[PDB]
Each structure stands twice: as C-alpha cells, then as structure tokens.
Design a protein around this ligand. Structure first.
Ligand SMILES: Nc1nccc(-n2cc(C(=O)N3CCC[C@@H](N)C3)c3ccc(C#CC4(O)CCCCC4)cc32)n1
Length: 290
C-alpha cells in the first residue's frame, strides 16, 4: 500500500521540511525515477542538488529505498555525496553535492576524447567500483548519464536509483533493470548476476567515449535489446582510431563469460591506466570553452 510505503520511508529519512531552508529551485534534469533541481542553502549561500521522486509515479516503488538505505552517507572521493534525505508531501527528496561540470553525456555527444582522458574517467569509475563491489553494491545502470564532473575535472559516480545489495549469504540478483543499450548479455536472459554487470556496462561506456553512442544505439529499445542476446561482443566503428592498449583493456571488459570478465579490483593494475591524465586533462572538454 501507498501508506505503508510512506510509513517505512519516514523511518529512514531525516524528519522535517527542507523547503524551510531551500529556495531558488532550478530544474536541471528528469533522470531515472525523478526530476533533479538545484537550490541554495539560505543559511550558508552554498549550492546543492535535490532529487525529487514522486511515489505516485513509479514503475517499482521499492526502488526508492536503496539509494537512501544503501547510499546512506557513504563517503568516497569518486562517488556523489548524499547529505540528507527528506519525505516532503508525496515525494521523496534527496539533497546532495552539486557537481558543476555536468554529465559525461554532454562530452561524448559533442567532442572526441583522447586515450589520456578516457583512462582518467575509467580510473575514477573503477576506483569507485572497486570499493562498491567489495562492500557488496552493484550500480546496475552504469552509463554516460551516471557520470558527473566538477569544474576541476574530478569525476564522480551517480544515479544509484537502480543499485542493489549482495553482501554475504545470497550473493546474486536476477532483476531486469537498467538502460537497454548498456546492459550485460546475461541480463536480457534472466540469470543470477553479480557486480560484473557493471563492468560490462563500463565497457559499453568506453564504446561511448570512442563513438558517442552504445552498440546498436540506432535501433529502437527492444529491437536491440533482444539483438545483443545471442551475438558476440560488439566492436567499435572507430577501432582504427584506438591504440592497442585501449583495445586490450576493453577486450578484458566486454567478455561474454561473466566468470571471465575482469574484476575492478584486478582492473586497476592494468597498463592502459598509466595513460591516465590528471583530472585537469578533462577540463578542456567541458562547455566553458570546448
Ligand atoms: N550536477 C549534478 N549534481 C548532483 C546530481 C546531478 N544529477 C543530475 C541528474 C539528471 O537528471 N540527469 C543526469 C545528466 C543527464 C540528464 N539527461 C539527466 C541526476 C540523476 C540522478 C542523480 C543521483 C543520485 C544518487 O543516487 C547518487 C549517490 C547518492 C544518492 C543520490 C543525480 C543527478 N547533477
């Protein structure tokens, strides 16, 4: 029931009304399960971002739990920091860090990134994924929209609306959740899957950074959704533009066998991630000056 769900939420969220100390709401997106705004904290003049998700308009209402239960003040240098969570009226509100460089989607649709910057983004994603897999969490929707930047080129991971916990005891999942063009091959076929789905999506995101779109991004969602199931790993339309180091690194990502996919903890020792430029390398890719 709606009311039982609201009651359960009120036991984990911070009480009261955040509209007391927030104003100048500026809308910035409609991402995953809710709209995302920016507000100023009048008590300080600082800026924060606010994810508003209405319980009434949800496919699965049970998705709202995880990001306030799993990502409850979990700190990490490469993961968007959540400050507070409130239940306002009929919507759940998440207040967090304001990442000012936009999403990575804006860069891959407008410019071409050199291997030195691809390695930077990947180093950050794997750094955060390593810890997230050790603690038992799967992102389950890693893609361009899930990656935010600061003004200084630092990269953080976001959009945990689809994440899940595995930990000990039961260690797998079988839920068909995410974005169609970015998911694993043992996804569309319901099979017990662990953190490795993320890694696969990461590989597809690598493809993004090389071409500006996931394999079969031109086909409608189901038209490609089924299309990847039988096929072998896709390959980039611009493979001639990528060095063999990137190609090897990516060849240990888009492995069809989940038991022969690489693990983020073991992917950090790879050679390609020596090409990782300082975060400043990413800075010229943002809209300040392309
Ligand atoms: N600059 C800035 N800063 C902070 C947030 C933010 N942001 C914009 C979103 C948005 O709508 N986008 C993304 C861009 C492309 C567009 N198509 C759609 C968006 C969606 C979800 C979350 C999330 C979350 C958490 O799970 C992360 C861990 C802690 C709990 C909350 C954040 C989002 N953007």
């Amino acid at each position: 029931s709606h009311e039982q769900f609201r009651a359960a939420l009120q036991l984990v969220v911070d009480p009261g009304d955040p509209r007391s100390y927030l104003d100048n709401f500026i809308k910035i997106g409609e991402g995953s399960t809710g709209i995302v705004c920016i507000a100023t904290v009048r008590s300080s003049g600082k800026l924060v971002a606010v994810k508003k998700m209405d319980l009434r308009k949800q496919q699965r209402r049970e998705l709202l739990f995880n990001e306030v239960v799993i990502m409850r003040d979990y700190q990490h240098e490469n993961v968007v920091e959540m400050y507070n969570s409130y239940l306002v009226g009929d919507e759940l509100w998440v207040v967090m860090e304001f990442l000012e460089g936009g999403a990575l989607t804006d860069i891959v649709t407008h410019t071409r990134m050199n291997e030195e910057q691809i390695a930077a983004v990947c180093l950050a994603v794997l750094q955060a994924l390593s810890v997230l897999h050790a603690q038992g969490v799967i992102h389950r929707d890693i893609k361009s929209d899930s990656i935010l930047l600061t003004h200084d080129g630092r990269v953080k991971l976001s959009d945990f609306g689809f994440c899940a916990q595995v930990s000990k005891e039961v260690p797998r999942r079988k839920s068909l959740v995410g974005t169609p063009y970015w998911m694993a091959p043992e996804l569309i076929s319901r099979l017990p899957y662990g953190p490795e789905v993320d890694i696969w999506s990461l590989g597809i995101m690598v493809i993004e950074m090389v071409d500006g779109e996931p394999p079969y991004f031109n086909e409608p969602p189901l038209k490609a959704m089924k299309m990847i199931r039988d096929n072998l790993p896709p390959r980039l339309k611009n493979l001639h533009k990528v060095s063999p180091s990137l190609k090897g690194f990516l060849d240990r990502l888009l492995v069809r066998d989940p038991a022969q996919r690489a693990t983020a903890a073991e992917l950090l020792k790879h050679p390609f991630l020596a090409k990782a430029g300082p975060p400043a390398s990413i800075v010229p890719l943002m809209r300040q000056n392309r």
